[model samples]
Target: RKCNKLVPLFYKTCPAGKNLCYKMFMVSNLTVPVKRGCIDVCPKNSALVKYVCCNTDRCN
Candidate 1:
């Protein structure tokens, strides 16, 4: 079961041929600016990198 206070912040569904997913959960007290920075600096894609899917569900 999900928490009643745990509102749906972000959600994403994977697409065909893209078997990857990621998620960064933080305390609710944290600010949005910090979250944005973390998301921006995430090295999901770098040199020779491809698509990076960030989903809040089990990755296949």
Candidate 2:
């Protein structure tokens, strides 16, 4: 999915779960990069959510 236009957040979470939040920079794919791109997200670490996981943000 290189050059993919749909940079959907790296991870998908349930609704109202802050975990669903993702960086608007990265996208969904299987290829790993060595840059500031997206990657497997740790829900608790969601800067937009909370600690070590998502809480709520209409995330679905």
Candidate 3:
């Protein structure tokens, strides 16, 4: 997936279906400013785990 204004914050994958990958980005909250600090400070080997989306927006 391409990076948008959001920064790559976390990721997940399904156990039953390894091909099913889910990534979560740190999007700016309505009151926050857009920044690139995450890219500059966050480690590349950060730990990520499986996520289960249960809302209408389909994210976890």
RMSD of each: 10.0, 11.3, 11.2
Q: Which stretches of candidate 2 lie over 4 Å from their true place?
A: 1-18, 26-40, 43-54
Relative to the true structure, candidate 3 reaches a TM of 0.19
TM-score of each: 0.24, 0.16, 0.19
Task: Give the better candidate number (2 or 3) by lDDT.
Answer: 2
Q: After superposition, how far is residue 34 of candidate 1 from its true place, in Å?
A: 10
Write the candidate numbers in order of decreasing lDDT: 1, 2, 3
lDDT of 3 at 46: 34
lDDT per residue for candidate 2 within 1-60, as digits (tens), equals 111113334333333322233223223432432222122454433342221222344231
For 1-60, candidate 3 gives per-residue lDDT tens digits of 112222436332323323222333344332332332112122334333222222212132
Query: What lDDT does the true structure give each of the candidates?
Result: 0.30, 0.29, 0.28
Q: Model 2 scores what on Cα lDDT?
A: 0.29
